[PDB]
């Protein structure tokens, strides 16, 4: 995920958050890593 | 695979069946899952 979510834009479904992946930012944690995932989500549909 | 083969279209080779991935349908099995992989296979080539 560090390579595919932070150093790129992934198309893999539900791999870099929920929605359409735009970008991610890492944060360190005591014995691990926290990813902040920024996604695009559509809203307010109409029928045509 | 449930995320990437069923909830979307994958470009990963051989991850969602043999051929060019179109779509997949899940089925429940006892203690497991069965994937029905729908693929696109070209046929009847000519040379040019
Ligand atoms: C396209 O042309 C090639 C030859 O350039 C065909 O390959 C030949 O196929 C025949 C019959 O199977 C063999 O006897 C030859 O040995 C093959 N040639 C070579 C050099 O391998 C090929 O069959 C053609 N493709 C189509 C779809 O007709």
Swiss-Prot record, chains A, B:
Glycans are attached at residue 47. Disulfide bonds join 5-16. Subunit of the fusion protein that is processed upon entry into the host cell. Mediates fusion of the virion and cellular membranes by functioning as a class I viral fusion protein. Contains a viral fusion peptide that is unmasked after S2 cleavage. This cleavage can occur at the cell membrane by host TMPRSS2 or during endocytosis by host CSTL. In either case, this triggers an extensive and irreversible conformational change that leads to fusion of the viral envelope with the cellular cytoplasmic membrane, releasing viral genomic RNA into the host cell cytoplasm. This is Spike protein S2'. The chain holds residues 1028 to 1075 of 1273 of the full protein.
């Amino acid at each position: 995920k560090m390579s595919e979510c932070v150093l790129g834009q992934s198309k893999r479904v539900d791999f870099c958050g929920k929605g359409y992946h735009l970008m991610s930012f890492p944060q360190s944690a005591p014995h691990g890593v926290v990813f902040l995932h920024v996604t695009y989500v559509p809203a307010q549909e109409k029928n045509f």
